Structure formats: C-alpha cells, structure tokens
Design a protein around this ligand. Sequence first.
Ligand code: HEM
Ligand SMILES: [Cl-]
Ligand SMILES: [Cl-]
Ligand SMILES: [Cl-]
Ligand SMILES: [Cl-]
Ligand SMILES: [Cl-]
Length: 152
Amino acid sequence: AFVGLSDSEEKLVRDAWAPIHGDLQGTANTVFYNYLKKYPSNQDKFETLKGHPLDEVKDTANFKLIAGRIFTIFDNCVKNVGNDKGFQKVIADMSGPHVARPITHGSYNDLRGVIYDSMHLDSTHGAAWNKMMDNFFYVFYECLDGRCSQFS
Ligand code: HEM
Ligand SMILES: [Cl-]
Ligand SMILES: [Cl-]
Ligand SMILES: [Cl-]
Ligand SMILES: [Cl-]
Ligand SMILES: [Cl-]
C-alpha cells in the first residue's frame, strides 16, 4: 500500500539524493551502464540499443537519452516526495509507456538495486529512501496492472 513519508523523512530523501541531483545525467550514464552490464538480458528491451555491443552503444546519444529519462523521473519523484498526489502523478504518467512492454518485475527491481548500491546510504537515510521507492513501486505496479486511475 502507499505509505506517506514524514517531514523529517522527506528531508532525509532529499539529502540522500542531493549528490545525484547535482550530477544527474553523469550518474544516470554510469548507473544505466552498470545495470545493463550486470543484467545483460535487458539491453534487448530497448529497441534503439538492441543488436549492438553494450560498449559500442554506451557513449551514444540514444543511450544517454534513455539513462537521462529514467533519472529525470526519479529526480521528479524526489521533487514531489512531500506531495503524495504529485508523486503518484509523476509515476502515473511514465507508467503508460511500460504497460504493454514485456518487462518483468525482476528487471525493474534489479534497476532499483543498482541505484541503491550506487548511493551507499547509511541506514537512517536508507530507510527513508526505501519508503519512497516502496511507494514508487506500489504506484508503478498498480498502474502496470491497470489500476492507475485510483491515484487521480
Ligand atoms: C523503474 C524505473 C524506470 C523509469 C523511471 C523509467 C522511465 C521511462 C521514461 C521517462 C520513458 C519515456 C517515455 C517513452 O518515450 O516511451 C520510458 C520508456 C521506456 N522504458 Fe522505462 N523506466 C524505468 C524502467 C525501465 C526498465 C527497467 C526497462 C527495461 C528493462 C524500461 C524500458 C523502457 C522502454 C523499452 C521504453 C519505451 C521507449 C523505448 O523504446 O525505449 N524502463 N521509461
Ligand atoms: Cl540478465
Ligand atoms: Cl555486449
Ligand atoms: Cl527507460
Ligand atoms: Cl506540497
Ligand atoms: Cl547517507
């Protein structure tokens, strides 16, 4: 279920994200690369990347666009962390493009974990971050299951 964050938890999330917020595209490029490398089945899901070596596509425009758009969504979720409707809306809007797609929960969760590992958070900040991401996934998966308009 969706579980709101306190004012203090919101602050924790914003602080946890600040290093990424301040280097958003550069972090996105690295994290997205590490994700595709560690979990090689996922590159094929990206039609613009499909059929080429990872190391061939990593410094291309299409690759950086994809990495950037994932991170832009999380940056906006963080923006909206103190507004559950606003937060849900960011997710609602990005969910439609995924609904029809053959992407497993495993794949999305593997990406969440690459992000987590990259942030090297202490347990206090990690707890708050995971509250947010649990909300993120709750909303996203409700929307993938065709129960998106409950957030409207
Ligand atoms: C969970 C965090 C994710 C976020 C924030 C996110 C965000 C986005 C955004 C903003 C778009 C652009 C809308 C469009 O042009 O279609 C998009 C499209 C898409 N995403 Fe995601 N995404 C996530 C996870 C994933 C994962 C894990 C995969 C594949 C393993 C994936 C595969 C795709 C594909 C195939 C498209 C369609 C456009 C395209 O062909 O690339 N997404 N995503
Ligand atoms: Cl894999
Ligand atoms: Cl490869
Ligand atoms: Cl994506
Ligand atoms: Cl607000
Ligand atoms: Cl920390």
